[PDB]
């Protein structure tokens, strides 16, 4: 098919300047087809540029679009806080087939940030259970980009452990991220020494934090 | 009577236009679309295209650096639009 | 200075500079890079439409317009100006009276083929930056006839291949949406089979109790033969 | 104006079937097709099909030609989605914009584009029993954790299926509170967690105490988090 | 360039001969047939089409 | 039940693909000298008028 | 309708002088059509030129027709007293139209 490659496919911007986000078709097609959308993060996608450079109705005159054959670009100016989500690209085969795209995330605002990183053992309670979590947190951390390390008695350990990050938040535009490491009670008792290692941007010297099991 | 009918027909408008096919010059259609832009809005659009208004001077002028086109030094252009208003102050040239 | 091989090119002109968006440029201004043919000036920069000598040309989106002159019409010379939900349709006299409704998949399908026409055609987007010049200020003999010569044989020449397009299109179009009507006709035929003849105009005589339920049926698809068999009395 | 109405989210058991339903006001639902498009966790748009109101003409995906049956209701205006036989990687969230334009000739490219959309149906697909969750303590470190800095949280794990809602000491404390988004253990059930920062100082004079509701379940579970102490 | 412009006016020129002359015999053979429909739907239930 | 393929129609319609065929895989431009396109560097006049 | 302007609508020459008359087209016509014709006073319609520029049969050598496109001309050498009278521009399409002009008066 009429496969759509979309790049950059993460784009880090200030707020206030120019973006340009690339569409590229495998195959030459009409700028009939190939119009461009927004999904914002937990709402329906909605329309932004039908066609190839008509505006759709409501959206901002900044919202631009242009472009033929195999190359097609969407240009926003003096971006606001409304504008960050990710971006689709689409277009149409005659008997109706709608290839879409990868999509570029627009992961915006800077300021790097040092994270702040806390470690929380394991409960008595879920002890009870059988089945011992230890969560390591990264609290108000830019860039995204951060690397946890499971260390147990200064031995690392490889897949035995999850992790979650939360979106941008609209305050203060930094990222949070969690790391569970999940064990049974007796792997657990089996150890003294549980540490995470965190490894990021903003911190020089990576930061370990440790806590002794049957230690407060 | 246990007899009906069934007629089977197609759609016809009060305003017809006018095709030519291979054939007949002239025949007459309910829709037709215009293939050929026979109009101009008057005004020569900015985006996206960089156009530089050449105002007095020619390009070559502007190249020479006669002083009317000393705005126009180290520019960057996609469509230098000159002008018929175009004359030059300074040592007659030619330009071979 | 700085010599780049480059896309930049310059133009001739004397219209303002206004604050739009266009993606065509010509002298005397900006044009839509949409419709596949032009006749403003030969000068062009940027993704523009081909440059004819014709004024206007037509293309057909829609089927031959036949006007209408009690009793019911069909196909054969008739063309019925009320039907507005649909292109082709069904008329009916049965005994409780006379009804119209639309057949909705045969007028889907001709206006999908049209509609795959245009988008071959309006699409396109020729993309030219720097070229040769046509307007010339002094008389300079040799490669002035040359260069003119292209671009009036290069001119010419598109101006055939347009004008052959549209006409074989509207052809093509014109032939089409008739057809349709003829496939209507005859799968009409063969699903009445024993019970109806031809009328001469394109009214189905058929011979059989019909209500509105009948009439229904015919056009569903789902009329049977079988079930209305003994009305074959017809001949006798 | 014109509005696009889905149906409501569905948990189904692997190998079954379910239909999903779109709805349309304001527009004239026969001139406009509606076509489905989902969206599986971590991944893009993917289409599915087209049913079209004027003509019952469809359309489907090569990889969901034989499970998927689409179908259209002219009263009043509604598109159904039956997808059979689902598997795992069929969770995903179901959106119905609205088509192309079946009823004239088209020169425009808005109706050749999906224009309006409808909010989204989620379809989780898995074999696991709805289980209420439990609810462990992630208790502030000693030393302070920092010098003005305590961290404390709840560990909500073993739930299933989606969604939870997590509000702390009854909606008073709204500030630096992070509920990280869920992650599909390898047994099937969803483990998260939620944090939230608070003055080192505060943590004698306030009682921190999490809020967990899970309506699938009907099971509300609330947790006093504090410093343990030995 | 004139050998350009020859080469591309002839080949429109041949597809022109070519394209109007099917057309021509198209349209000859579609009256026929036309008649022919015409003659039956007129004669009705009387007679058949002999082959 | 069985199939028995009617050859005749097959080979008349065989026979008009073959025409069509014919006609247009048997074309020998004989072009010899012409002009370039290849220019290692810029000129002016000839050169927007050669490309054109 | 397609509408054909004559001029000059009256033409003053003296006798043995060379006259040109003119008609446009209002939309381009194939030379296949466009003919003219000369009405002296109290007497039918005569035709003078078929097609764009061929003479009718019987016709004298002086009357030369010509022109392409929306213009058309019809020139008259060494005018003689015969050749007083109105003279009609005529076009023709394929519903059959003869499209007729206000006609030029020759008063010589
Ligand atoms: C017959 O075939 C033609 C050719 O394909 C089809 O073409 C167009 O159909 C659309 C209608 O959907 C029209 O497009 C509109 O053109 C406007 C430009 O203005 C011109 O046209 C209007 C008449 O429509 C004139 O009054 C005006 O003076 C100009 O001449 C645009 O402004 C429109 O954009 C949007 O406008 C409003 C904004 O509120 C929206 O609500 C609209 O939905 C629209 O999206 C739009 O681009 C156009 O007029 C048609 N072209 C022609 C040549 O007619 C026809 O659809 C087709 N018709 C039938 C019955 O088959
Ligand atoms: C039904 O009622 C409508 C009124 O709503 C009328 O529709 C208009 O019909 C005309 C004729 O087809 C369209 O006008 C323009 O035709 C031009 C050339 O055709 C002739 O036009 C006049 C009128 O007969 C003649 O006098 C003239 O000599 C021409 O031979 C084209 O140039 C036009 O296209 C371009 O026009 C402008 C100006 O350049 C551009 O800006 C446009 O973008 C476009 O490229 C146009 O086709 C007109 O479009 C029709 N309007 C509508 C709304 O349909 C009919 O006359 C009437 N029909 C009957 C049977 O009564
Ligand atoms: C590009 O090219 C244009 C055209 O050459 C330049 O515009 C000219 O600028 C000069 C300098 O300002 C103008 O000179 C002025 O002429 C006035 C009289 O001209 C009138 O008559 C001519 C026809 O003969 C008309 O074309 C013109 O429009 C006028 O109607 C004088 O009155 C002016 O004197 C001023 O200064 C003195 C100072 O002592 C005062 O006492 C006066 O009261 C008055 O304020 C002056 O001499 C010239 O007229 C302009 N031409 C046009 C057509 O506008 C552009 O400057 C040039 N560059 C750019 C970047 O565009
Ligand atoms: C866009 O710009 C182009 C280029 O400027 C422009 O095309 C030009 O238009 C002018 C004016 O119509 C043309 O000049 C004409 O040339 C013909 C042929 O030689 C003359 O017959 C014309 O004479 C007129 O005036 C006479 C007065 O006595 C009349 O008797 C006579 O009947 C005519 O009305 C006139 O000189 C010119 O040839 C073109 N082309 C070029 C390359 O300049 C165009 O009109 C602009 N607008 C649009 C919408 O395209
Ligand atoms: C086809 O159209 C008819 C129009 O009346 C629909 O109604 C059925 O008509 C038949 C007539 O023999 C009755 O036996 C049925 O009971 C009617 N059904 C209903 C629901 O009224 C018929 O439903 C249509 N069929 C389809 C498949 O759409
Ligand atoms: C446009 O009008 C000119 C006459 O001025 C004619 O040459 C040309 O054929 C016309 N184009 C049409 C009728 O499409």
Redesign the pocket.
């Known amino acids: 098919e009429i496969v759509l490659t979309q790049s950059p496919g993460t784009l880090s911007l200030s707020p206030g300047e120019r973006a340009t986000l690339s569409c590229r078709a495998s195959q030459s097609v009409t700028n009939r087809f190939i119009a461009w959308y927004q999904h914002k993060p937990g709402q329906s996608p909605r329309l932004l540029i039908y066609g190839a450079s008509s505006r759709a109705t409501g959206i901002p005159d900044r919202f631009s679009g242009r472009g033929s054959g195999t190359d097609f670009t969407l240009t926003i100016s003096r971006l606001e806080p409304e504008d960050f989500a990710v971006y689709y690209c689409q277009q149409y085969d005659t008997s109706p087939r709608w290839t879409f795209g990868q999509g570029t995330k627009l992961e915006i605002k800077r300021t790097v940030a040092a994270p702040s990183v806390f470690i929380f053992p394991p409960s008595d309670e879920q002890l009870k259970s059988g089945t011992a979590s230890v969560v390591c947190l990264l609290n108000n951390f830019y860039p995204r980009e951060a690397k946890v390390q499971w260390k147990v008695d200064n031995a690392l350990q490889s897949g035995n452990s999850q992790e979650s990050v939360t979106e941008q938040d609209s305050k203060d535009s930094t990222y949070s991220l969690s790391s569970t490491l999940t064990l049974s009670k007796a792997d657990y008792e089996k150890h003294k020494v549980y540490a995470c290692e965190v490894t990021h941007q903003g911190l020089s010297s990576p930061v370990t934090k440790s806590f002794n099991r049957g230690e407060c | 009577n246990s007899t009906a009918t069934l007629c089977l027909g197609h759609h016809a408008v009060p305003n017809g236009t006018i095709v030519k096919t291979i054939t007949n010059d002239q025949i007459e259609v309910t829709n037709a679309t215009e293939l050929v832009q ?3 809005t008057g005004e020569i659009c900015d985006s996206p295209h960089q156009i530089l208004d050449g105002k007095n001077c020619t390009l070559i002028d502007a190249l020479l650096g006669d002083p009317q086109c000393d705005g126009f030094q180290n520019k960057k252009w996609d469509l230098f639009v000159e002008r018929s208003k175009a004359y030059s102050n300074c040592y007659p040239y030619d330009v071979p | 200075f700085k010599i780049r091989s480059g896309k930049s090119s310059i133009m001739r002109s004397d219209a303002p500079i206004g604050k739009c968006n266009s993606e065509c440029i010509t ?2 201004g900006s044009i839509p890079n949409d419709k596949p043919f032009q ?3 030969r000068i062009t920069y940027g993704a523009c439409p081909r440059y004819v000598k014709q004024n206007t040309l037509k293309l057909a989106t829609g089927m031959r317009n036949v006007p209408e002159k009690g009793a019911i019409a069909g196909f054969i010379e008739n063309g019925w100006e009320g039907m507005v939900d649909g292109w082709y349709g069904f008329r009916h006299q049965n005994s409780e009276g006379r009804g119209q409704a639309a057949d909705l998949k045969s007028t889907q399908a001709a206006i999908d083929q049209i509609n795959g026409k245009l988008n071959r055609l309006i699409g396109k987007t020729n993309e030219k930056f720097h070229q040769i010049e046509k ?1 010339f200020s002094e008389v300079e003999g040799r490669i002035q006839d040359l260069e003119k010569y292209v671009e009036d044989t290069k001119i010419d020449l598109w101006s055939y291949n347009a004008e052959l397009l549209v006409a074989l299109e509207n052809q093509h179009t014109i032939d089409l949406t008739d057809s349709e009507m003829n496939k209507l006709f005859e799968k009409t035929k063969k699903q009445l089979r024993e019970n109806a003849e031809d009328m001469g105009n394109g009214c189905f005589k058929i011979y059989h109790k019909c209500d509105n339920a009948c009439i229904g049926s015919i056009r569903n698809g789902t009329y049977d033969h079988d079930v209305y068999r003994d009305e074959a009395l017809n001949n006798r | 104006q014109v509005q696009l109405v889905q149906s409501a989210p569905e948990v189904k058991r692997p190998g079954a079937s379910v239909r999903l339903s779109c709805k349309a006001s304001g527009y004239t639902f026969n001139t406009y097709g509606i076509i489905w498009v989902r969206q599986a966790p971590g991944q893009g748009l993917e289409w599915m099909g087209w049913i079209s109101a004027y003509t019952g003409n469809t359309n489907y995906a090569q990889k969901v030609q034989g499970r998927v049956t689409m179908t259209t209701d002219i009263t009043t205006s509604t598109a159904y989605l039956e997808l059979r036989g689902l598997r795992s990687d069929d969770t995903a969230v179901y959106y119905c914009a609205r088509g192309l334009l079946q009823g004239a000739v088209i020169l425009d490219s808005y109706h050749y584009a999906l224009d309006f959309w409808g909010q989204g149906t989620t379809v989780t697909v898995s074999g696991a029993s709805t289980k209420g969750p439990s609810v462990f303590p992630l208790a502030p470190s000693s030393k302070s954790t920092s010098g003005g800095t305590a961290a404390l949280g709840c560990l909500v794990k073993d739930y299933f299926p989606e969604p939870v809602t997590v509000s702390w000491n009854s909606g008073a404390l709204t500030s630096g509170v992070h509920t990280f988004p869920a992650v599909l253990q390898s047994s099937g059930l969803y483990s998260l967690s939620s944090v939230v920062t608070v003055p080192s100082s505060s943590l004698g004079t306030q009682t921190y105490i999490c809020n967990v509701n899970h309506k699938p379940s009907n099971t509300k579970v609330d947790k006093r988090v504090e410093p343990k102490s030995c």
């Open positions: 026979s109009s101009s | 002298p005397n006749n403003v000036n307007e």
